[PDB]
Design a protein around this nucleic acid. Structure first.
Ligand SMILES: [Zn+2]
Lengths: 98, 48, 330, 83, 417, 50
RNA sequence: CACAUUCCAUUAAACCACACCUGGCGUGUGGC
DNA sequence: TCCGCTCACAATGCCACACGCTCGGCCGTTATTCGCA
């Protein structure tokens, strides 16, 4: 079972599993630990948000790849900002300096 | 926001729902009825 | 299934352009090609479905001839005296029944044949309805102006065509405007659009006068000739058989009022009413007027006319392409 | 692009400024038609148009607006992700 | 530059002008884009543009000013007017506008309005505070429209018989009930000619719906007033478009205290087009007719009235009957007790080469006491009582022989005594 | 309307209201169909395959 | 006067899916 | 008064079930209006 790029769930903008009949594979905790045991900060950031979280980030990365631009965009995860705004929905300002 | 609680049209009587969307719609209607209690013809049991 | 065949034959879109017997023959041909596609061989079969109510009862054609090629449709003359055939051609017998006229491929080929038949029917209807207006002028918007020809809307599913050779570098077209002409040829046996309307024909202007000039049409005048170099010069020659009218003075109107009208209708072409005579000499003298001609000769064995002109009116004698002469030679 | 997130209590005016409307009806969506409520749970003038670059009633579908509020109900024509 | 000079001019002068301006090959396209490019060039080398037309407001918010000769159709010749004018001058659909316009830049292609000058032939200040159409109080017709010219031609006798059978006034509803083959086209033509020759102050409008184009071109340059017509060549959408256009123009003109006169032919074809253009409401009678499908035609026929405040509106719509189908039949039944002046033209007299074929026995007009004097009405009633025992063809030929000798209906009446 | 049905089956524009809710075989999986079963609610007439 | 929100020659814009339950998946409750 | 020590959890944790993707009527009152300027 393999998936290049397909549909995403409605409740979350992440790839699905076997029931989607085209989904990818699950990235749990143990291999997160195995990867952070090595280096690969760029690789982990790619595996985390550029391929799963940033709905616009994955599209921009695909656009860059299809024209030969093998470079990544930082693309802070949007779901991160959503959980920040939820914490504010209970409450705290989420300030960003630099 | 509604996207964290999507209500997708579904085939048949089944309709994908959620939970918080009823909790604070309940608080909305409760605030509406306490507004009914807020302004007109209202004895101290109101303020309670 | 017969109920569905009914629903179809009675629920057609164009009940007028597609008569009932036409639906019958179209369904027959569709079921015939369906049955042809059924068998792996090639055997022609008509269905002869009950035209009014009932279902189908196919047949089998056999084409009486001494040949043997494709024996499915072969019956020799000698070995045909049985069944009381006794004929040379037309052995369309009922050897084949049990046609299936509702399955997938049959339905698809029937829909295709019905489309083809309704297209043929609408073509025939439009052509034999708007062919009656072959001599008179036809008015209508242009569907679309292509390179080889232009196609024109004339009404309800009404199409006409004007060829490119009859067009002009200055006569110009684009979908939306109404250009008129005379229906000069009708080919109802063609494959597509078959309402050929032209504009460069001379008699066109004649009929123009017929719809404008009151003197023509009542036989009191006689529009004889018309020399039309399209866009160059459009002269007309008339003759009056009565003894109380003039050929040119009445037809010009009032100092170029109706002649200029028909000119700007034709496209502003220079129209000069010439007066032909009973002899070709005066005819060609007037055709190259106003100008002097020092010599007029006719030659029968050469089928030509020698017109030698003098110096003093060359600006009117030749013009462009010798148009003042080009009309006469035409 | 940032650093050192901060967690503390809340403030009402910040909630008001971050909110783009006030919900007032408990109904989420109509049951007969799938149109969202005017000021209910599933709202449009508070979150955004349910479709990308399409007005709620449809008269402001044109991309030239790109923020023009509708006169009947009122929507800021933009992408759905804004919601 | 003004617009009408280039609109109502022949296309040949436009071709000459476009060739003299040193432009692209102009004669290869429509008249619409031809005049559009001509105006664009004259604006690039020249002053502001001066346009005019009738305004239509869409459901979008803006407005389109369209010309009369194109039957108010879309194209490059239309004038875009922003909703800002509709908010400032409080414009409405059918407003006759004329004023200054500018050329378009990128993003636009229509000539945008710069400043209005004449709104419905009136000043914007006077038109600001006005009275609505439906807010007026209808009434009966009081001023009778004289249709007799007085010359007594070979065909004006038709109009004379009309004055004998249906006294028309400002605010009356006329229904011409006639089968095909009956000769109503030249009848309406003569009516328009007489009503423009006798009453040139009131605006005259004709409407040919689902009509042959040759008749359209021969009527658009034979009678006065703008001849707007939607021939059968186009779908019913254009028919309802031009219906709304003409009805709103008439409403605005009568709101500006102008006697408006509409000639509509035929009303059955217009109602059929309405029936096929407006969505169905489920309920269907015989002949493929919907219930609400007649609501808009009914309204169109009911717009005509005699306004008590100022001006009036007189519609004359002819109903085509005896065609075989049920659409025309049910339309004529629904419109039978609708118009207050019917005029029946039986084909039995028309096929006998006896024109005008007018069923005087079945024709009539209500409240004619408010249009004619006392002794005139008495003579009309005497003539009606005399002709009623007769048939149709015999009465028609008797009336023809009694009217050919005389030249005026007054001498006719006194000689009939 | 049934006349509209038979017209669209032969002439006219595309099918207005379909959404193409037809089920297709999933991607990647292949095979040969060997049997079809149909179950119909009472009142609904069975199709020719039923 | 004035803002101005236009009926949209090749063609980039009109693309896409919703099922069987002790291991196709999750919410609610209960359990230590 | 001070110090030490079990019960409902909390919960790695799954599981099961209901189904899907305390009960009843009524009382009351209301706010109920979808106007485009
Ligand atoms: Zn809206």
């Amino acid at each position: 079972h393999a998936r290049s790029t397909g549909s995403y769930s409605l409740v979350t903008q992440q790839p699905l599993g076997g029931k989607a009949q085209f989904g990818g594979q699950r990235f749990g905790e143990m291999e997160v630990w195995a990867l952070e045991a090595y280096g690969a900060a760029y690789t982990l950031q790619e595996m985390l948000t550029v391929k799963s979280d940033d709905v616009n980030g994955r599209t921009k990365m695909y656009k860059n790849i299809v024209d030969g631009n093998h470079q990544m965009e930082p693309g802070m995860p949007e779901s991160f900002n959503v959980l920040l705004k939820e914490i504010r929905s209970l409450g705290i300002n989420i300030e960003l300096e630099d | 926001p509604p996207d964290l609680r999507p209500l997708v049209p579904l085939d048949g009587g089944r309709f994908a729902t959620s939970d918080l969307n009823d909790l604070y719609r309940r608080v909305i209607n409760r605030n509406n009825r306490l507004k009914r209690l807020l302004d007109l013809a209202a004895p101290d049991i109101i303020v309670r | 299934m017969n109920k569905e065949i009914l629903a179809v034959v009675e629920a057609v879109s164009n009940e007028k352009a597609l008569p009932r017997e036409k639906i019958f023959e179209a369904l027959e041909s569709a079921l015939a090609t369906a049955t042809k596609k059924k068998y792996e061989q090639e055997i022609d079969v008509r269905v002869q479905i009950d035209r009014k109510s009932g279902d189908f009862d196919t047949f089998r054609r056999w084409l009486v001839v001494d040949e043997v090629t494709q024996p499915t449709k072969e019956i020799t003359l000698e070995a045909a005296r049985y069944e009381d055939e006794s004929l040379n051609l037309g052995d369309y017998v009922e050897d084949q029944i049990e046609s299936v006229t509702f399955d997938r491929i049959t339905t698809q080929t029937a829909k295709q044949v019905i489309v083809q038949k309704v297209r043929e029917a609408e073509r025939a209807m439009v052509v034999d309805q708007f062919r009656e207006h072959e001599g008179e002028i036809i008015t209508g918007v242009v569907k679309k102006v292509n390179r080889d020809n232009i196609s024109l809307d004339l009404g309800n599913n009404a199409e006409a065509v004007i060829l490119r050779e009859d067009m002009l570098p200055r006569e110009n077209f684009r979908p939306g405007d109404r250009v008129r002409g005379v229906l000069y040829s009708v080919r109802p046996e063609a494959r597509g659009a078959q309402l050929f309307v032209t504009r460069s024909k001379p008699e066109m202007l004649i009929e123009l006068f017929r719809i404008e000039v009151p003197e023509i049409g009542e036989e009191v005048i006689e529009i004889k000739a018309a020399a039309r170099d399209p866009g160059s010069r459009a002269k007309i020659a008339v003759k009056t058989n009565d003894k109380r009218i003039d050929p040119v003075g009445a037809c010009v109107g009032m100092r170029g009022a109706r002649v200029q009208a028909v000119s700007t209708e034709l496209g502003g072409e220079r129209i000069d009413i010439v007066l032909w005579d009973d002899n070709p000499a005066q005819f060609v003298i007037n055709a190259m007027a106003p100008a002097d001609v020092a010599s007029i000769v006719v030659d029968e064995d050469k089928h030509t006319m020698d017109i030698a002109v003098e110096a003093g009116n060359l600006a009117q004698a030749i013009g462009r392409n010798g148009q003042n002469v080009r009309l006469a030679s035409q | 692009e940032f650093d050192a997130i901060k967690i503390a209590l809340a403030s009402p005016d910040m909630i008001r400024s971050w909110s783009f409307g006030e919900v007032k009806k408990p109904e989420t969506i109509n049951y007969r038609t799938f149109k969202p409520e005017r000021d209910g749970l599933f709202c449009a003038r508070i979150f955004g148009p349910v479709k990308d670059y399409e007005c709620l009633c449809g008269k402001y579908k044109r991309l030239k607006h790109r923020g023009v509020i509708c006169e009947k109900c009122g929507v800021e024509v933009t992408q759905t992700k804004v919601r | 530059m003004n617009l009408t000079e280039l609109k109502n001019t022949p296309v040949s002068e436009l071709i000459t002008l476009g060739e003299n301006m040193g432009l692209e090959n102009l004669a290869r396209m429509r008249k619409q884009d031809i005049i559009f490019a001509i105006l664009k060039q004259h604006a690039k080398s020249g002053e502001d543009i001066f346009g005019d037309g009738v305004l239509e407001i869409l459901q979008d918010g803006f407005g389109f000013l369209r010309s009369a000769d194109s039957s108010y159709l879309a194209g490059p010749d239309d004038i875009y007017v922003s909703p800002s004018q509709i908010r400032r001058f409080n414009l409405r659909t059918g407003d006759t506008i004329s004023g200054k316009i500018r050329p378009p830049k990128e993003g636009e292609r229509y000539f945008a309005l710069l400043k209005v000058n004449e709104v419905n032939f009136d000043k914007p200040e006077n038109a600001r505070n006005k009275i609505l159409f439906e807010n007026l109080t209808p009434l009966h017709a009081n001023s009778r429209l004289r249709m007799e010219r007085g010359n007594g031609s070979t065909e004006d006798l038709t109009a004379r018989v009309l004055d004998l059978a249906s006294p028309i006034g400002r605010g009356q509803r006329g229904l011409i009930v006639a089968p095909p083959k009956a000769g109503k086209t030249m009848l309406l033509q003569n009516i328009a000619q007489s009503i423009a020759y006798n009453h040139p102050d009131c605006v005259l409008m004709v409407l040919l719906i689902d009509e042959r184009p040759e008749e359209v071109t021969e009527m658009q340059r034979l009678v006065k007033g703008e001849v707007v017509a939607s021939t059968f060549d186009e779908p019913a959408s254009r028919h309802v478009q031009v219906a709304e256009m003409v009805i709103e123009k008439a409403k605005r003109l009568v709101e500006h205290k102008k006697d408006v006169i509409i000639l509509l032919d035929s009303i059955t074809r217009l109602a059929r087009a309405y029936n096929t253009v407006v969505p169905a409401s489920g309920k269907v009678l015989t002949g493929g007719v919907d219930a609400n499908a007649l609501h808009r035609p009914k309204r169109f026929f009911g717009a005509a009235r005699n306004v008590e405040e100022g001006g009036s509106l007189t519609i004359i719509a002819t109903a085509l009957i005896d065609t075989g189908s049920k659409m025309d039949e049910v339309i004529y039944e629904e419109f039978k007790g609708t118009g207050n002046m019917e005029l029946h033209l039986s084909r039995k007299i028309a096929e006998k080469r006896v024109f005008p074929a007018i069923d005087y026995n079945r024709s009539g007009t209500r409240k004619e006491e408010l249009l004619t004097t006392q002794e005139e009405l008495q003579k009309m009633w005497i003539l009606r009582k005399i002709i009623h025992p007769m048939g149709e063809i015999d009465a028609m030929e008797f009336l023809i022989n009694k009217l050919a000798m005389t030249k005026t209906n007054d001498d006719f009446f006194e000689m009939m005594k | 309307t049934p006349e509209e049905k038979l017209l669209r089956a032969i002439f006219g524009e595309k099918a207005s209201d379909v959404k193409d809710s037809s089920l297709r075989v999933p991607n990647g999986v292949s095979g040969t169909v060997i049997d079809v079963q149909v179950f119909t609610r009472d009142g609904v007439e069975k199709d020719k395959r039923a």
